[PDB]
Design a protein around this motif. Structure first.
Motif, PDB file in Angstrom:
ATOM      1  N   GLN A 344       0.321  -1.168   0.074  1.00 58.19           N
ATOM      2  CA  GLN A 344      -0.219  -0.036   0.458  1.00 58.19           C
ATOM      3  C   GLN A 344       0.643   0.976  -0.335  1.00 58.19           C
ATOM      4  OE1 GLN A 344      -3.086  -0.807   3.280  1.00 58.19           O
ATOM      5  NE2 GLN A 344      -4.236  -1.442   1.515  1.00 58.19           N
ATOM      6  N   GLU A 345       1.972   1.159   0.833  1.00 61.07           N
ATOM      7  CA  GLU A 345       2.706   2.184   0.964  1.00 61.07           C
ATOM      8  C   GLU A 345       3.646   2.768  -0.733  1.00 61.07           C
ATOM      9  OE1 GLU A 345       5.068   2.958   3.923  1.00 61.07           O
ATOM     10  OE2 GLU A 345       6.655   4.294   2.198  1.00 61.07           O
ATOM     11  N   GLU A 348       1.102   3.949  -2.965  1.00 58.66           N
ATOM     12  CA  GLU A 348       0.818   4.836  -2.975  1.00 58.66           C
ATOM     13  C   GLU A 348       2.008   6.416  -3.508  1.00 58.66           C
ATOM     14  OE1 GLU A 348       0.704   8.535   0.404  1.00 58.66           O
ATOM     15  OE2 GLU A 348      -0.160   6.443   1.086  1.00 58.66           O
ATOM     16  N   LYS A 352       2.694   8.217  -7.135  1.00 57.37           N
ATOM     17  CA  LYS A 352       2.786   9.826  -7.788  1.00 57.37           C
ATOM     18  C   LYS A 352       3.924  10.029  -8.297  1.00 57.37           C
ATOM     19  CE  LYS A 352       3.238  14.030  -4.963  1.00 57.37           C
ATOM     20  NZ  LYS A 352       5.395  13.695  -5.154  1.00 57.37           N
TER      21      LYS A 352
END
Ligand code: 0KX
Ligand code: MG
Ligand code: MG
Length: 430
Positions: A344-345, A348, A352
């Motif tokens: 999940q990190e 993200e 970006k």
DNA sequence: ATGGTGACGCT
DNA sequence: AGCGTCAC
């Protein structure tokens, strides 16, 4: 003599931020400015692990890798800022974002090579040649170098640091041959004027102070940078190298701080970089390999050819967590939950990255450690990274590592896992 | 039980 | 490809 290359063909700088993560927290929180303070990660175990330390706290003996509870013993008034935690783990976004601030500023001056989160090499050769054309044989005032140290000076025929710095600068400038545009020492000096401007821009536009080294190659610039840290820059000329190296421990040169540098010391029976000059190129190659021997032969003479690579962005985006001792992951549910957190990190950060930088990662590397192995990584497996989807990434990761599980019982994990690491790699344009 | 990164070399 | 070194 007339055919002996002296490695004076480029002007290279290395800019390294002072106590970087601490300055990021001090900019944010003015209460931490000009104080003994440190950045810590994970508060529960011995007050947290210290990862960066202000210069005021270093005076008390506070260091990186110390537990904060221990650092408080040396410095009872130490202030602390903690790394953000997201999804159960330390999250370094704020420091990554601050690093982009600095790197974008540096990139205005020259093409940079991002060497770490807080340092970049700069090839200033072109910028110096241009500035020498405007400085139409006009001398270079000391006022243009207000934070510059000339390594090895003053020398020859005031007991305070700034007085010494100025005396050395005056000696250097008084001997400089400004009429010769091809003088390497002149080139370095103009390099240093440029670095003063770059450093002032960084501080003005970010609030962050830094050190820098200016020399003719990366290794000398890096070494120079550390000679007068913090908040100062250092010029290491080709001529300074014999004295500088004569008492320079081998381990201080970049890439020699580990096993190779230890083997140089042991095999050759020497201590200092300068002592290398006494071996032939072939002798060095015979002990350390063709590439390392050639590199050592030249480097001990102050000569290195490694170019400043035009690369501002990291080539990999990774997320990891250790699970030490008794926290090691022993169930299949645990393994899956944490793979998902990491994924999940990573999603993200990747999303970006794709919007900002017009590229997509194509390979996912999955790395683990099992309890009882004493190597950082026990096992590394790659798979295709085809969608920026955390459930997909975490499912795939599990798929490529699941046969590590030596358990017969379905829902247990044996041996338990002491580290999980997901790394996105092999970027292509998008 | 510093930890959480990142670049690059060897086979 | 997967392992190892070196470092911020
Ligand atoms: N082992 C390490 C080395 C660095 N870092 C992070 C925290 C540092 O503030 C930052 C930069 O590393 P650094 O240049 O080695 N040290 P730092 O900038 O804190 O202090 P200086 O000695 O450069 O003034 O990277 C880390 O988290 N773990
Ligand atoms: Mg630094
Ligand atoms: Mg650094």
């Amino acid at each position: 003599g007339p055919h002996m290359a002296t490695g004076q063909d480029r002007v290279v700088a290395l800019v390294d931020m002072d106590c970087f993560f601490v300055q990021v927290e001090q900019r944010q929180n003015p209460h931490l400015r000009n104080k003994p303070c440190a950045v810590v990660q994970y508060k529960s175990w011995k007050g947290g692990g210290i990862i960066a330390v202000s210069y005021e706290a270093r005076a008390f003996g506070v260091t990186r890798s110390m537990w904060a509870d221990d650092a408080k013993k040396l410095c009872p008034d130490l202030l602390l800022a903690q790394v953000r935690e997201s999804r159960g783990k330390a999250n370094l976004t704020k420091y990554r974002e601050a690093s982009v601030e600095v790197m974008e500023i540096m990139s205005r001056f020259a093409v940079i090579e991002r060497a770490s989160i807080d340092e970049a090499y700069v090839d200033l050769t072109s910028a110096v040649q241009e500035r020498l054309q405007k400085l139409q044989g006009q001398p270079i005032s000391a006022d243009l170098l207000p934070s510059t140290y000339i390594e090895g000076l003053p020398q020859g025929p005031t007991v305070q640091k700034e007085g010494m710095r100025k005396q050395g600068l005056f000696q250097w400038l008084d001997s400089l041959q400004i009429d010769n545009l091809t003088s390497p020492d002149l080139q370095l000096t103009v390099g240093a004027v440029i670095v003063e401007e770059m450093r002032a821009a960084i501080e003005r536009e970010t609030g962050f102070q830094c050190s820098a080294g200016i020399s003719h190659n990366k290794v000398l610039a890096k070494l120079a940078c550390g000679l007068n840290k913090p908040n100062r820059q250092t010029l290491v000329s080709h001529g300074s190298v014999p004295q500088l190296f004569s008492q320079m421990p081998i381990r201080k040169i970049r890439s020699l701080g580990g096993k190779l540098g230890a083997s140089v010391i042991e095999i050759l029976g020497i201590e200092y970089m300068g002592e290398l000059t006494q071996f032939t190129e072939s002798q060095l190659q015979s002990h350390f390999g063709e590439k390392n021997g050639s590199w050592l032969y030249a480097m001990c003479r102050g000569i290195e050819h490694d170019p400043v690579k035009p690369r501002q962005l990291p080539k990999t985006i990774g997320c990891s967590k250790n699970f030490p001792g008794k926290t090691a992951l022993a169930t299949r549910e645990q393994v899956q939950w944490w793979l998902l957190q990491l994924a999940q990190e990573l999603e993200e950060r990747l999303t970006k990255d794709r919007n900002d930088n017009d590229r997509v990662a194509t390979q996912l590397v999955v790395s683990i450690r099992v309890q009882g192995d004493k190597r950082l990584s026990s096992l590394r497996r790659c798979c295709a990274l085809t969608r920026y989807d955390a459930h997909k990434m975490s499912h795939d990761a599990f798929t490529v590592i699941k046969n590590c599980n030596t358990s017969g019982i379905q829902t247990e994990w044996s041996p338990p896992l002491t580290m999980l690491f997901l790394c996105a790699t092999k970027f292509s344009a998008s």
